[PDB]
Amino acid sequence: SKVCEISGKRPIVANSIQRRGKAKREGGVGKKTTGISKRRQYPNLQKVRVRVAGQEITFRVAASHIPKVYELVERAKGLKLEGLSPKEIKKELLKLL
Amino acid sequence: ASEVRIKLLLECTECKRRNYATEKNKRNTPNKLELRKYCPWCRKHTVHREVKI
Amino acid sequence: MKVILLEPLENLGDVGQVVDVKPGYARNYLLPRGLAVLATESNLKALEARIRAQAKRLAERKAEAERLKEILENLTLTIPVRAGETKIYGSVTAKDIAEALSRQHGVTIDPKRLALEKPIKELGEYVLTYKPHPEVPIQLKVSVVA
Amino acid sequence: KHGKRYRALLEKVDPNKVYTIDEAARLVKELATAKFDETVEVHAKLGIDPRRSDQNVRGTVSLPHGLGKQVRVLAIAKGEKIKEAEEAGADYVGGEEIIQKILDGWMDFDAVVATPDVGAVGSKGRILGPRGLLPNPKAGTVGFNIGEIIREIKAGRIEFRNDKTGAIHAPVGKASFPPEKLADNIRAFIRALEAHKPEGAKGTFLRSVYVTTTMGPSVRINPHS
RNA sequence: GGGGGGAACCUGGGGAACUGAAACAUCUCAGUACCCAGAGGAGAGGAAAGAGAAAUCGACUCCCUGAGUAGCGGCGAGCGA
RNA sequence: UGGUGUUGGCUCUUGGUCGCGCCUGCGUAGGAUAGGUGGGAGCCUGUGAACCCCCGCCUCCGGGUGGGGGGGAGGCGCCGG
RNA sequence: GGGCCUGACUGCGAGGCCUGCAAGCCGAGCAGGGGCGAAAGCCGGGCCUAGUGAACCGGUGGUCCCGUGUGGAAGGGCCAU
RNA sequence: GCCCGGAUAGCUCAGUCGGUAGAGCAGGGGAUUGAAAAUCCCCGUGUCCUUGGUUCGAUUCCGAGUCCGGGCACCA
């Protein structure tokens, strides 16, 4: 999925590592790797609809930065943002970042 | 070399350092072997107990 | 997520109180419905010096609950619809009641505060709770006709 | 639901609040309302399994400050030991025919000790045993210095043993002891027990330490305090 | 103001296999080829939440040495500061 | 597919964790139902008696268990067994 | 067949056999400390030639050799296996 | 290797939270039946795997061991 609108958390290219065998730490002879495959770790993006400037706005933001959004919305109250449209509203809220 | 003739160790019950490894048919002698063996640590012969290998 | 109770709640407390509930309830129910506010330093600054304001508008909730309470307790609500001998061809919710007091009776109440758990589909008299203020049971009898 | 002389004892005690090694020793005497010198008791709950055949807590320590209890030692010994057995505390020696002197019913003794030669004591043991009287050198009560053994028997030597309920039990003295008389009594009770732990035990060796008296109420006290 | 082009050079996102292991999966090939994005005459880096042991130095970049060294490795091939 | 996030409120019920509160424990013998360990020669009731009645538990059916009433100081205790 | 005993040893090893290597093999003798026998002497498994498997990885017992600034510890080494 | 499961009548299995080793299957016999049968009545027989310890006694409770079964892995 695309970037996080706040954190910019992108999908990363991780290497799924199918390991095997008992661990040396548990006396095992060693963690024999059976195979290594590329994959992608996707951010936990969500859609977040918010009524700002009498306008409902949706952010594809990571799960972590959800409350950061509401931080932004509350901060927008010291802004004169109406009657802008949701495009300009979203741009300006991005500017508050 | 078998499950009935198992391996085993021989520890000096003075030094407590396993100084001898050997075998026995648990069938034949199902008791702990014990032998005056030379403990290298003790630097003197001593009853060495059959400690499980 | 500490939130500032802006009003009394059946399982949260009352205005001025600051509880910490899971984010779903406050941020999906409370924040939208303004029943609470997050616990920012900005809020905690104006927490006091607005507690007086919060309980001020609370008392406005009370006094309005009375002055309109007896305003709309002493009457009967009528509902002309299309319905059958044991059934309604249509259906009614709190919104139709708001049209009832708005156009028919002229008095202005709130649709949301009126509790309508199921949109009515039968005829006759029913009693409704309005409760504009917590612990303010404003009964109301409604009639549905054809 | 108790005796009004004891219900008063129930009233002047604080159940959940935890006292000190000295604080209940004040309460232990003021709770001494029985019509005789009650016995101070430290029923310190052990953290050990008796069902385990490894945690056999049974030892002894001679409490100073006396005990206030009456101890008559039925010592058993031979080979010149009857002399030193009769002396140094034991009143019933001896020293070989007291066995057949057991009826049983000749239970006019408060303690029994024996030198390791006897020997002929354990067999004759079966009724002398189950009432906690068989001579055993586990905790003090056996040895060829039997009279010397009995010398400290008079000197507040309380024995302690785990029970089936994981508890250990021994009085520090009668309910006539001052708190700093019991202060060395109590702390001697904790110190000896801690020295006799069956090593290898789930967590603490002691659950709690309560202090009651003969017909007296319990007391919540903090051990090692 | 941007667009798009620019021989190579450069970061950054992606990223092989052939190949070696005398097979081959880990591994190596190699983060290489190549793709995309970004510029630039360079780029990148860059001013210690460092290094590493001296209580020592004092951003960064590059050349030599360190050194095939320490190490990593089906402790193999090899890789390797 | 289970955990977790997104993801909340409301109840209802059940399995564990510790709170305590209580009751439970019966070979014979032994007065009787003896859970063990310690201390115990004493308890105790007008911070109302053994008695007798009523109320519930258990009951191994003899009783124990507790509560209410009259009664409301006579029963219990090592010792006897 | 009986008596006693555990040398079915420690540290080693002159020397040789065989042999591409590696492996395999035999061994006086030396010291330690013992068994046997009076002693001389023998005993470093079995009358012998088959009963077996390199290294790596890891286990377990000892050693205290290393222990990443120091002390420990992690962990490794070495011996045994 | 780690985990746990049981060792009981000829068998299966009960099994005390320590007072007793038991239910049925098998066996036999009696009645029973034309046979087969079933049924029925009654007897059958155990260190309660071994060692221990505790408590008056321990099948029980327990420490060990063995067998025993399974699973859970790891394999230089």
Ligand SMILES: [Zn+2]
């Ligand atoms: Zn030794």
